[PDB]
Amino acid sequence: STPIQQLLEHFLRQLQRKDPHGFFAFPVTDAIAPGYSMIIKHPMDFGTMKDKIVANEYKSVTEFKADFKLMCDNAMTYNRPDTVYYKLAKKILHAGFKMMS
Ligand SMILES: C/C=C/Cn1cc(-c2cccc(C(=O)N(C)C)c2)c2cc[nH]c2c1=O
């Protein structure tokens, strides 16, 4: 609806294209990642970001960028550097921030 919502939906679509496996698509469960909720205090994922856009909870691109960075930082905190997850998070973090200027 609103201009910011339209822009953030556009950014979100482009970011999700960089995650074809959808590792970032939904909240990480402790079943898939043992101990996750005990290690990551502020979980974030593309699905939650979509819900926040729809609810009109972002009022600036800066806020959206902060949630995107949080999501990537979480993946680089929980996962070791040699994992596909860590490597994807670092790659998408830089590409996403460039893509968003
Ligand atoms: C780039 C990752 C972002 C978030 N994330 C997602 C998964 C995840 C989620 C859903 C499915 C799978 C998967 O395909 N597995 C576990 C085989 C992984 C996972 C598993 C261990 N750590 C993580 C993780 O940090």
UniProtKB/Swiss-Prot annotation:
Compartment list: Nucleus
Region Histone H4K5ac H4K8ac and histone H4K5bu H4K8bu binding, residue ranges: 77-79
Domain Bromo: 1-101
Site feature Histone H4K5ac H4K8ac and histone H4K5bu H4K8bu binding, where: 32, 85
Biological role: Plays a role in chromatin remodeling and regulation of transcription. Acts as a chromatin reader that recognizes and binds acylated histones: binds histones that are acetylated and/or butyrylated. Component of SWI/SNF chromatin remodeling subcomplex GBAF that carries out key enzymatic activities, changing chromatin structure by altering DNA-histone contacts within a nucleosome in an ATP-dependent manner. Also orchestrates the RAD51-RAD54 complex formation and thereby plays a role in homologous recombination (HR).
Written domain comment of the UniProt record: The Bromo domain mediates interaction with histones that have acetylated lysine residues at specific positions. Also recognizes and binds histones that are butyrylated.
Quaternary structure and partners: Binds acetylated histones H3 and H4. Binds butyrylated histone H4. Component of the multiprotein chromatin-remodeling subcomplex SWI/SNF called GBAF, which includes at least BICRA or BICRAL (mutually exclusive), BRD9, SS18, the core BAF subunits, SMARCA2/BRM, SMARCA4/BRG1/BAF190A, ACTL6A/BAF53, SMARCC1/BAF155, and SMARCD1/BAF60A. Interacts (via N-terminal bromodomain) with acetylated RAD54. Interacts (via C-terminus) with RAD51.
Full protein name: Bromodomain-containing protein 9
Organism: Homo sapiens (Human)
Lineage of the species this protein comes from: Eukaryota, Metazoa, Chordata, Craniata, Vertebrata
Gene assigned in the entry: BRD9
Shown part of the complete sequence: 138 to 238 of 597
